Amino acid sequence: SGEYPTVNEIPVGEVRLYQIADGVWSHIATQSFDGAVYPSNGLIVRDGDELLLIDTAWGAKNTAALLAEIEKQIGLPVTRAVSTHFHDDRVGGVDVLRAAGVATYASPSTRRLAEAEGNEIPTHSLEGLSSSGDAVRFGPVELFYPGAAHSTDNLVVYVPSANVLYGGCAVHELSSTSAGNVADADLAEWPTSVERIQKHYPEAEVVIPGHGLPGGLDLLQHTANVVKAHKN
Ligand SMILES: C[C@H](NC(=O)c1ccc(CN)cc1)c1cccc2c(-c3ccc(CN4CCOCC4)nc3)c(C(=O)O)[nH]c12
Ligand SMILES: [Zn+2]
Ligand SMILES: [Zn+2]
């Protein structure tokens, strides 16, 4: 009923959308992993009379449900998708997207990691993102590589028309106590990568984490704090 939707409010397999700004939505789905249930976010950005998707809904059936929810709520075609790192909450569902006419993209680093891990593999490589601080335009967004954080390949996404920063899994929600799933993380570089984001996007008005509730710029400092403490 208008609040940001939380894990126990979304059965696994349904998807909900949340309007962030004009022409910007998040998508929220839930999935089981190792016997626990988790929410996850992605982004939808209006691209004229088409849509750009950022990240899958964490699984094939969830991603099919995402496409149906988009058709119901927005009614414009998803033509392109970007996955922001190689984990299944970002790429699981790419094969569904590719069979639904969506052109799928990720950095070469993400594509290599996804292939090696046995995850679904976006079709197209995003060059120009291999060095920390790199940025490229992609439709109505800017893609930014902040350096290693949650993963070595993690990208963040900025929507300049709305000053929306989508941090993906490099950014945690304000209630976070822990750095989340850190198996592929660089805890030592993560704060430096967050500082890069802070420096590059000082006008961000909304910050969206990979999992959990959006907020403002404080999510960036909170993330640095929690990762440093975790490492400690
Ligand atoms: C899909 C992703 N697979 C990996 O990561 C992965 C998988 C396999 C291998 C081994 N080669 C290596 C890594 C993932 C799964 C489950 C939870 C998460 C989380 C996550 C997010 C938030 C929290 C915190 N909540 C815990 C419950 O109580 C409330 C707070 N815990 C975990 C993330 C993430 O942090 O991005 N990713 C996940
Ligand atoms: Zn991840
Ligand atoms: Zn994640």
XYZ file of N, CA and C in Angstrom, residues 18-211:
582
model
N 8.272 -0.370 -7.429
C 8.172 0.811 -6.552
C 8.629 2.016 -7.318
N 7.789 3.034 -7.430
C 8.169 4.249 -8.144
C 9.168 5.057 -7.315
N 10.341 5.287 -7.849
C 11.399 6.032 -7.186
C 11.364 7.491 -7.566
N 11.167 7.780 -8.852
C 11.157 9.120 -9.411
C 10.463 9.040 -10.735
N 10.277 10.168 -11.408
C 9.708 10.139 -12.738
C 10.564 9.271 -13.674
N 9.949 8.252 -14.234
C 10.644 7.354 -15.141
C 11.655 6.431 -14.487
N 11.600 6.244 -13.172
C 12.515 5.357 -12.453
C 11.743 4.540 -11.463
N 11.877 3.221 -11.524
C 11.271 2.278 -10.605
C 12.352 1.375 -10.053
N 12.154 0.870 -8.860
C 12.858 -0.341 -8.458
C 11.947 -1.530 -8.645
N 12.539 -2.707 -8.790
C 11.825 -3.966 -8.730
C 12.339 -4.757 -7.558
N 11.423 -5.464 -6.893
C 11.703 -6.207 -5.678
C 11.149 -7.598 -5.829
N 11.970 -8.586 -5.526
C 11.568 -9.994 -5.563
C 12.220 -10.704 -4.386
N 11.815 -11.941 -4.163
C 12.414 -12.713 -3.081
C 12.835 -14.080 -3.605
N 13.866 -14.624 -2.985
C 14.390 -15.903 -3.418
C 14.958 -16.636 -2.206
N 14.942 -17.949 -2.295
C 15.592 -18.827 -1.321
C 16.999 -19.127 -1.760
N 17.920 -19.177 -0.802
C 19.309 -19.509 -1.053
C 19.853 -20.131 0.206
N 20.383 -21.349 0.108
C 20.942 -22.036 1.266
C 19.945 -22.075 2.430
N 18.669 -22.238 2.111
C 17.678 -22.422 3.149
C 17.240 -21.180 3.907
N 17.486 -20.011 3.355
C 16.919 -18.779 3.887
C 16.370 -17.969 2.742
N 15.435 -17.076 3.068
C 14.749 -16.244 2.094
C 15.249 -14.815 2.187
N 15.540 -14.212 1.049
C 16.076 -12.895 0.947
C 15.334 -12.065 -0.079
N 15.168 -10.769 0.156
C 14.723 -9.863 -0.881
C 15.905 -9.411 -1.729
N 15.610 -8.894 -2.912
C 16.613 -8.223 -3.711
C 15.971 -7.186 -4.586
N 16.729 -6.154 -4.927
C 16.288 -5.045 -5.759
C 16.955 -5.090 -7.136
N 16.262 -4.484 -8.092
C 16.816 -4.035 -9.343
C 16.206 -2.699 -9.725
N 16.496 -2.230 -10.929
C 16.058 -0.921 -11.385
C 15.397 -1.028 -12.753
N 14.482 -0.110 -13.038
C 13.858 0.060 -14.341
C 13.920 1.548 -14.655
N 14.419 1.909 -15.829
C 14.556 3.297 -16.211
C 13.899 3.509 -17.564
N 12.968 4.466 -17.656
C 12.343 4.774 -18.918
C 13.344 5.382 -19.874
N 13.300 4.897 -21.096
C 14.282 5.128 -22.201
C 13.418 5.498 -23.402
N 12.828 6.665 -23.383
C 11.876 7.041 -24.437
C 10.532 6.311 -24.341
N 10.208 5.530 -25.371
C 9.099 4.604 -25.354
C 9.562 3.159 -25.129
N 10.751 2.973 -24.573
C 11.268 1.667 -24.197
C 11.745 1.758 -22.741
N 12.133 0.616 -22.184
C 12.674 0.509 -20.836
C 14.049 -0.151 -20.860
N 14.917 0.380 -19.978
C 16.180 -0.224 -19.617
C 16.016 -0.902 -18.258
N 16.394 -2.164 -18.187
C 16.357 -2.953 -16.966
C 17.763 -3.041 -16.371
N 17.892 -2.846 -15.071
C 19.115 -3.112 -14.348
C 18.852 -4.282 -13.392
N 19.533 -5.399 -13.669
C 19.539 -6.638 -12.894
C 18.263 -7.433 -13.071
N 18.431 -8.760 -13.038
C 17.319 -9.672 -13.031
C 16.630 -9.641 -11.675
N 15.527 -10.416 -11.575
C 14.779 -10.570 -10.332
C 15.203 -11.831 -9.556
N 16.413 -12.337 -9.786
C 16.973 -13.461 -9.015
C 16.240 -14.730 -9.298
N 16.385 -15.236 -10.506
C 15.857 -16.503 -10.926
C 15.025 -16.386 -12.175
N 14.900 -17.520 -12.854
C 14.123 -17.572 -14.095
C 12.643 -17.255 -13.889
N 11.996 -17.937 -12.941
C 10.588 -17.700 -12.774
C 10.322 -16.301 -12.208
N 11.159 -15.828 -11.299
C 11.011 -14.462 -10.812
C 11.145 -13.460 -11.954
N 12.086 -13.696 -12.865
C 12.323 -12.766 -13.968
C 11.182 -12.774 -14.964
N 10.588 -13.944 -15.228
C 9.365 -13.977 -16.015
C 8.267 -13.169 -15.328
N 8.142 -13.315 -14.020
C 7.132 -12.565 -13.267
C 7.429 -11.056 -13.316
N 8.708 -10.666 -13.311
C 9.103 -9.276 -13.455
C 8.605 -8.709 -14.782
N 8.845 -9.431 -15.874
C 8.410 -8.949 -17.168
C 6.870 -8.776 -17.196
N 6.141 -9.710 -16.599
C 4.687 -9.597 -16.540
C 4.250 -8.409 -15.708
N 4.927 -8.168 -14.595
C 4.589 -7.050 -13.743
C 4.863 -5.718 -14.445
N 5.972 -5.630 -15.193
C 6.261 -4.458 -15.997
C 5.172 -4.217 -17.036
N 4.726 -5.277 -17.703
C 3.699 -5.089 -18.709
C 2.405 -4.568 -18.074
N 2.046 -5.075 -16.892
C 0.852 -4.688 -16.185
C 0.925 -3.232 -15.711
N 2.063 -2.814 -15.121
C 2.181 -1.568 -14.427
C 2.673 -0.420 -15.308
N 3.477 -0.709 -16.310
C 4.144 0.304 -17.117
C 3.750 0.202 -18.583
N 3.778 -0.993 -19.142
C 3.277 -1.212 -20.484
C 4.190 -0.776 -21.597
N 5.483 -0.587 -21.343
C 6.492 -0.306 -22.356
C 7.446 -1.495 -22.437
N 8.016 -1.756 -23.583
C 8.849 -2.931 -23.739
C 10.239 -2.737 -23.118
N 10.692 -3.789 -22.439
C 12.076 -3.849 -21.996
C 12.936 -4.254 -23.172
N 13.865 -3.394 -23.576
C 14.684 -3.701 -24.748
C 16.100 -4.063 -24.403
N 16.630 -3.614 -23.266
C 18.009 -3.852 -22.901
C 18.044 -4.093 -21.397
N 19.015 -4.882 -20.958
C 19.268 -5.123 -19.542
C 20.749 -5.078 -19.295
N 21.134 -4.558 -18.128
C 22.502 -4.570 -17.641
C 22.528 -5.326 -16.322
N 23.467 -6.258 -16.159
C 23.696 -6.912 -14.897
C 24.911 -6.308 -14.226
N 24.781 -5.971 -12.939
C 25.798 -5.195 -12.243
C 26.867 -6.019 -11.530
N 26.691 -7.326 -11.415
C 27.794 -8.248 -11.092
C 27.313 -9.646 -11.435
N 28.160 -10.653 -11.151
C 27.970 -11.995 -11.715
C 27.101 -12.923 -10.899
N 26.684 -12.539 -9.696
C 25.913 -13.415 -8.833
C 24.490 -13.620 -9.370
N 23.855 -14.681 -8.909
C 22.535 -15.079 -9.423
C 21.439 -14.057 -9.165
N 21.558 -13.187 -8.156
C 20.584 -12.130 -7.961
C 20.704 -10.986 -8.998
N 21.694 -11.089 -9.873
C 21.942 -10.105 -10.907
C 21.796 -10.662 -12.324
N 22.223 -11.929 -12.507
C 22.202 -12.583 -13.822
C 21.216 -13.731 -13.890
N 20.683 -14.235 -12.765
C 19.795 -15.397 -12.860
C 18.469 -14.935 -13.398
N 18.115 -15.395 -14.604
C 17.020 -14.806 -15.357
C 17.455 -14.197 -16.676
N 18.758 -14.081 -16.930
C 19.232 -13.591 -18.211
C 18.759 -14.447 -19.389
N 18.681 -15.750 -19.201
C 18.236 -16.590 -20.319
C 16.735 -16.283 -20.612
N 15.902 -16.081 -19.570
C 14.507 -15.667 -19.750
C 14.471 -14.352 -20.536
N 15.289 -13.384 -20.125
C 15.311 -12.073 -20.805
C 15.689 -12.229 -22.268
N 16.749 -12.969 -22.536
C 17.225 -13.099 -23.899
C 16.125 -13.725 -24.785
N 15.381 -14.733 -24.281
C 14.230 -15.327 -25.033
C 12.998 -14.421 -25.132
N 12.911 -13.361 -24.393
C 11.858 -12.367 -24.420
C 12.244 -11.130 -25.209
N 13.341 -11.221 -26.016
C 13.708 -10.118 -26.871
C 14.600 -9.086 -26.245
N 15.066 -9.313 -25.054
C 15.843 -8.306 -24.369
C 17.309 -8.559 -24.682
N 18.012 -7.523 -25.084
C 19.467 -7.579 -25.255
C 20.136 -7.416 -23.889
N 20.969 -8.384 -23.513
C 21.575 -8.439 -22.194
C 23.043 -8.063 -22.262
N 23.470 -7.264 -21.292
C 24.786 -6.679 -21.223
C 25.416 -6.846 -19.850
N 26.754 -6.924 -19.814
C 27.519 -6.868 -18.570
C 28.959 -6.585 -18.940
N 29.768 -6.173 -17.975
C 31.174 -6.003 -18.244
C 31.789 -7.336 -18.634
N 32.955 -7.286 -19.313
C 33.680 -8.532 -19.582
C 34.058 -9.250 -18.317
N 34.397 -8.521 -17.269
C 34.726 -9.144 -16.005
C 33.529 -9.957 -15.474
N 32.358 -9.341 -15.458
C 31.162 -10.052 -15.027
C 30.897 -11.266 -15.897
N 31.017 -11.132 -17.215
C 30.752 -12.254 -18.085
C 31.699 -13.435 -17.814
N 32.981 -13.150 -17.606
C 33.943 -14.199 -17.296
C 33.599 -14.871 -15.986
N 33.278 -14.100 -14.958
C 33.005 -14.654 -13.640
C 31.740 -15.482 -13.679
N 30.699 -14.984 -14.371
C 29.461 -15.724 -14.491
C 29.703 -17.078 -15.179
N 30.454 -17.046 -16.301
C 30.776 -18.292 -16.994
C 31.502 -19.279 -16.091
N 32.507 -18.802 -15.370
C 33.287 -19.695 -14.536
C 32.489 -20.276 -13.407
N 31.558 -19.530 -12.878
C 30.727 -19.958 -11.760
C 29.558 -20.842 -12.167
N 29.236 -20.911 -13.447
C 28.055 -21.635 -13.886
C 26.789 -20.839 -13.806
N 26.873 -19.521 -13.803
C 25.697 -18.662 -13.791
C 25.352 -18.278 -15.216
N 24.148 -17.735 -15.425
C 23.746 -17.281 -16.753
C 24.596 -16.108 -17.196
N 24.811 -16.024 -18.505
C 25.836 -15.130 -19.045
C 25.200 -14.113 -19.952
N 25.227 -12.814 -19.616
C 24.773 -11.767 -20.541
C 25.485 -11.868 -21.888
N 24.776 -11.454 -22.940
C 25.293 -11.616 -24.298
C 26.410 -10.653 -24.669
N 26.257 -9.386 -24.302
C 27.082 -8.298 -24.816
C 27.999 -7.757 -23.739
N 29.240 -7.503 -24.116
C 30.251 -6.952 -23.233
C 30.250 -5.446 -23.219
N 30.333 -4.878 -22.019
C 30.418 -3.441 -21.780
C 31.878 -3.078 -21.549
N 32.493 -2.547 -22.581
C 33.897 -2.075 -22.521
C 33.932 -0.706 -21.846
N 35.131 -0.241 -21.534
C 35.283 1.076 -20.975
C 35.058 1.194 -19.499
N 35.001 0.063 -18.787
C 34.681 -0.008 -17.364
C 35.722 -0.774 -16.569
N 36.905 -1.051 -17.133
C 37.833 -1.945 -16.497
C 38.674 -1.309 -15.409
N 38.766 0.005 -15.332
C 39.583 0.699 -14.347
C 38.704 1.463 -13.367
N 39.036 1.367 -12.083
C 38.259 2.063 -11.072
C 38.156 3.539 -11.418
N 36.953 4.077 -11.263
C 36.616 5.427 -11.652
C 36.107 5.569 -13.076
N 36.118 4.498 -13.884
C 35.592 4.562 -15.224
C 34.085 4.742 -15.222
N 33.597 5.441 -16.218
C 32.188 5.661 -16.417
C 31.855 5.640 -17.889
N 30.702 5.111 -18.247
C 30.211 5.119 -19.624
C 28.711 5.412 -19.604
N 28.208 5.984 -20.666
C 26.788 6.180 -20.813
C 26.133 4.956 -21.450
N 24.913 4.682 -20.998
C 24.118 3.565 -21.504
C 22.669 3.994 -21.468
N 22.138 4.439 -22.585
C 20.790 4.979 -22.566
C 20.672 6.092 -21.575
N 19.621 6.045 -20.734
C 19.347 7.103 -19.779
C 20.155 7.021 -18.492
N 21.165 6.147 -18.415
C 21.964 6.037 -17.220
C 23.438 6.224 -17.526
N 24.206 6.410 -16.452
C 25.646 6.284 -16.445
C 25.999 5.036 -15.647
N 26.897 4.219 -16.182
C 27.465 3.077 -15.505
C 28.819 3.475 -14.961
N 29.125 3.096 -13.739
C 30.343 3.486 -13.052
C 30.974 2.293 -12.386
N 32.267 2.093 -12.584
C 32.998 1.027 -11.935
C 33.768 1.633 -10.760
N 33.380 1.381 -9.502
C 33.999 2.088 -8.360
C 35.257 1.423 -7.864
N 35.572 0.220 -8.344
C 36.576 -0.647 -7.757
C 35.922 -1.821 -7.040
N 36.780 -2.736 -6.600
C 36.303 -3.926 -5.942
C 35.615 -3.583 -4.618
N 34.544 -4.293 -4.321
C 33.765 -4.006 -3.118
C 33.093 -5.315 -2.687
N 31.773 -5.397 -2.885
C 31.042 -6.632 -2.716
C 31.606 -7.757 -3.602
N 31.981 -7.403 -4.810
C 32.660 -8.295 -5.754
C 33.673 -7.475 -6.521
N 34.561 -8.164 -7.280
C 35.568 -7.432 -8.034
C 34.987 -6.706 -9.224
N 33.836 -7.169 -9.706
C 33.224 -6.665 -10.920
C 32.065 -5.717 -10.677
N 31.691 -5.409 -9.453
C 30.466 -4.669 -9.218
C 30.438 -3.305 -9.873
N 29.317 -3.017 -10.542
C 29.040 -1.732 -11.138
C 27.962 -0.996 -10.357
N 27.992 0.325 -10.394
C 26.891 1.133 -9.919
C 26.307 1.923 -11.077
N 25.066 2.371 -10.901
C 24.297 2.992 -11.954
C 23.726 4.311 -11.460
N 23.895 5.378 -12.224
C 23.334 6.683 -11.879
C 22.345 7.088 -12.947
N 21.205 7.650 -12.507
C 20.175 8.155 -13.390
C 20.240 9.684 -13.289
N 20.901 10.366 -14.242
C 21.161 11.813 -14.038
C 19.887 12.630 -14.043
N 18.832 12.212 -14.749
C 17.647 13.033 -14.844
C 16.963 13.132 -13.476
N 17.198 12.168 -12.586
C 16.513 12.060 -11.325
C 17.458 12.062 -10.124
N 18.747 12.134 -10.326
C 19.742 12.046 -9.292
C 19.544 10.787 -8.430
N 19.276 9.670 -9.107
C 19.110 8.380 -8.446
C 20.398 7.577 -8.586
N 20.948 7.132 -7.462
C 22.125 6.281 -7.437
C 21.688 4.879 -7.042
N 21.863 3.953 -7.939
C 21.624 2.534 -7.715
C 22.965 1.896 -7.407
N 23.172 1.567 -6.139
C 24.469 1.050 -5.711
C 24.657 -0.414 -5.939
N 23.603 -1.139 -6.194
C 23.690 -2.571 -6.220
C 24.277 -3.122 -4.927
N 24.901 -4.298 -4.991
C 25.275 -4.985 -3.776
C 26.528 -4.412 -3.095
N 27.199 -3.455 -3.734
C 28.229 -2.657 -3.099
C 27.695 -1.699 -2.043
N 26.379 -1.499 -1.985
C 25.760 -0.573 -1.044
C 24.723 -1.333 -0.235
N 24.793 -1.188 1.076
C 23.848 -1.785 1.980
C 22.840 -0.802 2.529
N 21.689 -1.356 2.905
C 20.632 -0.582 3.503
C 21.035 -0.166 4.943
N 20.366 0.871 5.415
C 20.673 1.451 6.762
C 20.471 0.469 7.906
N 19.561 -0.503 7.806
C 19.425 -1.479 8.891
C 20.497 -2.549 8.923
N 21.349 -2.622 7.917
C 22.386 -3.646 7.847
C 23.295 -3.594 9.061
N 23.629 -4.769 9.546
C 24.574 -4.937 10.635
C 25.839 -5.551 10.109
N 25.711 -6.206 8.998
C 26.743 -7.067 8.502
C 26.914 -6.723 7.044
N 28.045 -7.091 6.599
C 28.363 -6.871 5.227
C 27.683 -7.843 4.292
N 26.622 -8.624 4.658
C 25.953 -9.511 3.704
C 26.818 -10.667 3.295
N 26.620 -11.145 2.058
C 27.377 -12.292 1.555
C 28.708 -11.787 0.971
N 29.788 -11.991 1.724
C 31.090 -11.378 1.466
C 32.081 -12.387 0.892
N 31.609 -13.539 0.410
C 32.560 -14.546 -0.027
C 33.422 -14.064 -1.202
N 32.895 -13.250 -2.071
C 33.626 -12.743 -3.220
C 34.090 -11.310 -3.056
N 34.007 -10.769 -1.845
C 34.231 -9.372 -1.559
C 35.717 -9.051 -1.364
N 36.040 -7.768 -1.450
C 37.355 -7.235 -1.084
C 37.101 -6.270 0.070
N 37.147 -6.751 1.352
C 36.757 -5.900 2.500
C 37.728 -4.737 2.658
N 38.986 -4.959 2.299
C 40.010 -3.923 2.409
C 39.785 -2.800 1.387
N 39.372 -3.117 0.137
C 39.174 -2.084 -0.888
C 37.784 -1.479 -0.839
N 36.831 -2.186 -0.254
C 35.435 -1.750 -0.287
C 35.251 -0.331 0.193
N 35.782 0.102 1.340
C 35.604 1.516 1.738
C 36.157 2.481 0.698
N 37.326 2.172 0.124
C 37.902 3.048 -0.905
C 37.006 3.144 -2.130
N 36.399 2.035 -2.515
C 35.443 2.039 -3.616
C 34.203 2.848 -3.287
N 33.683 2.743 -2.051
C 32.568 3.589 -1.639
C 32.932 5.060 -1.647
N 34.164 5.396 -1.180
C 34.595 6.795 -1.230
C 34.605 7.308 -2.662
N 34.977 6.453 -3.625
C 34.943 6.849 -5.019
C 33.518 7.192 -5.467
N 32.540 6.368 -5.053
C 31.143 6.635 -5.365
C 30.714 7.983 -4.760
N 31.032 8.174 -3.476
C 30.687 9.421 -2.787
C 31.253 10.638 -3.514
N 32.493 10.545 -3.974
C 33.127 11.664 -4.658
C 32.500 11.909 -6.014
N 32.137 10.833 -6.718
C 31.676 10.971 -8.077
C 30.208 11.439 -8.148
N 29.375 11.109 -7.152
C 27.933 11.379 -7.171
C 27.479 12.151 -5.948
N 28.044 13.343 -5.724
C 27.690 14.127 -4.518
C 26.285 14.663 -4.531
N 25.611 14.709 -5.676
C 24.259 15.229 -5.775
C 23.194 14.155 -5.747
N 23.566 12.914 -5.473
C 22.576 11.864 -5.408
C 21.513 12.201 -4.363
N 20.255 12.013 -4.724
C 19.123 12.243 -3.849
C 18.525 10.975 -3.290
N 18.539 9.917 -4.008
C 18.048 8.612 -3.615
C 19.207 7.647 -3.867
N 19.463 6.784 -2.900
C 20.451 5.716 -2.994
C 19.720 4.401 -2.769
N 19.842 3.471 -3.720
C 19.163 2.189 -3.678
C 20.188 1.092 -3.483
N 20.061 0.295 -2.424
C 20.991 -0.822 -2.189
C 20.578 -2.045 -3.012
N 21.486 -3.019 -3.106
C 21.161 -4.264 -3.792
C 20.082 -5.065 -3.137
N 19.954 -4.936 -1.835
C 18.979 -5.638 -1.019
C 18.487 -4.612 0.003
